[PDB]
């Protein structure tokens, strides 16, 4: 029991909670995000997460194979998940590159983001403590934008390719290569440290944040909604796809996570515990972030919505600020970023392993030939690093933001989750699936899961998509910038490169299989034993 609970606590939290959720919540205006978020956590989210584990357990096979047994026509969902994981793994590691750079820069007697005597700083600087007495900029924000990020005036201006962050990406990819090649993962007594350190750090940071002199305004911003004005189309896709990204459902790795488990287990209770713990830790760390932002606003005299960047940088603006104000700042900075790198790697390893297993299962005859595995992992890492280089240029932030919005989140997750629930509920049959679940776990899904698959998840995933297209607004990075049309075309190119895998495989199989049209449709709709 104890070891299982510890594994449950440690294995499923990740950067989706500590980094992604805060900046989406801040970008959509605080508390207005929590309403559509909890409307997607139940009636979708948790019922889809259970369905994902059950599919993997039921097939005893990866993402590519299970849909062959459930519904051959929709086998393309496996390739959709695999390509989503690929586009994710390309960009997800750049966060660890930034974290590693912060870790290296933390090795100083005085943190570089504490004061702006340093060379990279604009003359418009004002030390945060003196700013309360214009264009004044805080040292942390411009450190992030000019030393770490070296942000160029747009995606149209890639500029130079930063050697330091390229070294960081190479370092992290080398770690991943050697770990997955050797099969290294935290399983030993080191688990008691690895799985608990993130929660220790988050509790310490929450204590630091709430004790700040400006926490109350931050929490009031964080929890008081704007129900009458915030309901644009963006917030609804952001909220739903935050659940689906955080749970890593449509990525297909959870099919592997379930297939590895013993079948004779109460998968229902385990899935409800995991999904509630993940959503709870996200919601709890929200307090630390937004209390720190309330302190930043109180200490500078600007509205909370304006204190920090609304893009990916929110965590790397907020936590450095908090760690600047604790005894021996360097110690806690080092601890924070080591914790962040551990929390990131424990996810990166799982995603890479899932991708490698899926791709070798898609072509075992060549990939399974002994050293073929070791060579193939190196190939995948090399290609991923060569793509990641683009997000390391002076214009790299804009490409990273474009990936983070279109490539592995947004409307494509809603596409894949709609088709999963539609297939199982209406094509395969909720009745058949309930009988299968009775066989596996001993009791049927019940009404909440049954109707969540039949009606609620289809309805939500169609409504958010149609609403997005009916009231369409483009991407912006930090709210003053605008992406050019070619960048928005590239974003849709990624999203569609994920989404189209369903129609393409449907038509391919309808054409590749002999017989009359309806005969082929029946042959490919019917399950396999």
């Amino acid at each position: 029991k104890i070891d299982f609970v510890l594994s449950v606590a440690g294995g499923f939290v990740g950067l989706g909670n500590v980094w992604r959720f805060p900046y989406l919540c801040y970008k959509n205006g605080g508390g207005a995000f929590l309403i559509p978020y909890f409307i997607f956590l139940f009636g979708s989210g948790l019922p889809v997460f259970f369905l994902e584990i059950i599919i993997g357990q039921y097939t005893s096979e990866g993402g590519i194979t299970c849909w062959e047994k459930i519904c051959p026509l929709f086998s393309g969902i496996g390739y959709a998940s695999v390509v989503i994981v690929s586009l994710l793994n390309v960009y997800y590691i750049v966060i660890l590159a930034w974290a590693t750079y912060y870790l290296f820069q933390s090795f100083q007697k005085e943190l570089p983001w504490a004061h702006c005597n340093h060379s990279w700083n604009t003359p418009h600087c004002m030390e945060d403590t003196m700013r309360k007495n214009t264009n004044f900029t805080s040292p942390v924000i411009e450190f992030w934008e000019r030393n770490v990020l070296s942000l160029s005036p747009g995606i149209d201006h890639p500029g130079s390719l930063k050697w330091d962050l390229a070294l960081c990406l190479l370092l992290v990819w080398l770690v991943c290569f050697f770990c997955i090649w050797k099969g290294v993962r935290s399983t030993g007594k080191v688990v008691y440290f690895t799985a608990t350190f993130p929660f220790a750090m988050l509790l310490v940071l929450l204590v630091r944040g709430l004790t700040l002199p400006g926490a109350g305004a931050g929490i009031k911003f964080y929890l008081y909604p704007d129900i009458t004005r915030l309901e644009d189309p963006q917030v609804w896709i952001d909220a739903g796809t935050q659940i689906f990204f955080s749970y890593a459902i449509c990525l297909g790795a959870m099919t592997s996570l379930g297939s590895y488990n013993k079948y004779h287990n109460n998968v229902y209770r385990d899935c409800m515990l995991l999904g509630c713990l993940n959503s709870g830790t996200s919601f709890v760390s929200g307090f630390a972030i937004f209390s720190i932002l309330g302190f930043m606003a109180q200490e500078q005299g600007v509205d909370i919505a304006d204190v920090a960047e609304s893009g990916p940088g929110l965590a790397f603006i907020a936590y450095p600020k908090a760690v600047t104000m604790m005894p021996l700042p360097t110690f806690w900075s080092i601890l924070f970023f080591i914790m962040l790198l551990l929390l990131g790697l424990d996810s990166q390893f799982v995603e890479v392993e899932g991708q490698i297993t899926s791709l070798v299962d898609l072509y075992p005859s060549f990939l399974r030939k002994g050293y073929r595995r070791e060579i193939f992992i190196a190939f995948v890492c090399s290609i991923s690093y060569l793509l990641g280089l683009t997000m390391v240029t002076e214009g790299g932030m804009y490409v990273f933001q474009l990936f983070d919005y279109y490539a592995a989140s947004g409307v494509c997750l809603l596409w894949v989750a709609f088709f999963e629930c539609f297939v199982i509920a209406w094509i395969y049959g909720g009745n058949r699936f309930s009988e299968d679940i009775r066989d596996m776990i001993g009791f049927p899904p019940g009404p909440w899961m049954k109707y969540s698959w039949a009606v609620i998840t289809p309805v939500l995933c169609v409504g958010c998509f149609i609403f997005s297209l009916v009231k369409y607004v483009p991407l912006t990075y930090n709210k003053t910038y605008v992406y050019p049309n070619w960048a928005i075309g590239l974003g849709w190119s990624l999203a569609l490169s994920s989404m189209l895998c369903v129609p393409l495989v449907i038509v391919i199989r309808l054409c590749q299989t002999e017989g009359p049209f309806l005969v082929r449709v029946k042959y490919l709709l019917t399950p396999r034993e």
Partner: antibody
Amino acid sequence: EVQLVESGGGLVKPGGSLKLSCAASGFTFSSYAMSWVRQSPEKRLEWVAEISSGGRYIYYSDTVTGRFTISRDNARNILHLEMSSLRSEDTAMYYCARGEVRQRGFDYWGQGTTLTVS
Amino acid sequence: ENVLTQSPAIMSTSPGEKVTMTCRASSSVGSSYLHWYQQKSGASPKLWIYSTSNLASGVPARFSGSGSGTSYSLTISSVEAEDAATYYCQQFSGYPLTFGSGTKLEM
């Protein structure tokens, strides 16, 4: 969920064949797994066979693995147990028992019907 | 087959006394997958206890159960004349399903 009623008990020669029926009422018979449980003259219960709610999954006790075939009629709300070759040890009183939730046991039992061979 | 056996094959009893019965299995089974049934003489069995401690809808509160792993039990806080019946422990963790030998309260 209220009622279950077995039928078809009686006497049949050893090595013969016989088929039992178990009617159901008061619940959606097409959505609950059903089981047959056998009580010997020594009052000892034994399990016979299970059919899942949809009839796709079927399990048999080893002692009848090849002798008995279980089936159901969802439209008629009737459960069937067919015996192809009765051994002398098959005489008992047969109960059909509703068993959808394995974590919740056999919630309901029919009146039961005796079966004998000589 | 995971054979189940109950130790006290038959028990004499009088009103008001405390009474308990034991179930043991050839192989350990999860707590959730073990149940107890009551059969009155000349009548069909009825579910009495499920998931090893949960009480059925018609059972007096004086019944109770506990156990884990390979051995399980139920106990009566204080018997009454209406409790005279045979009780079977039954595992539900894996086929073939098996019922215990059954134990009867004779008075």
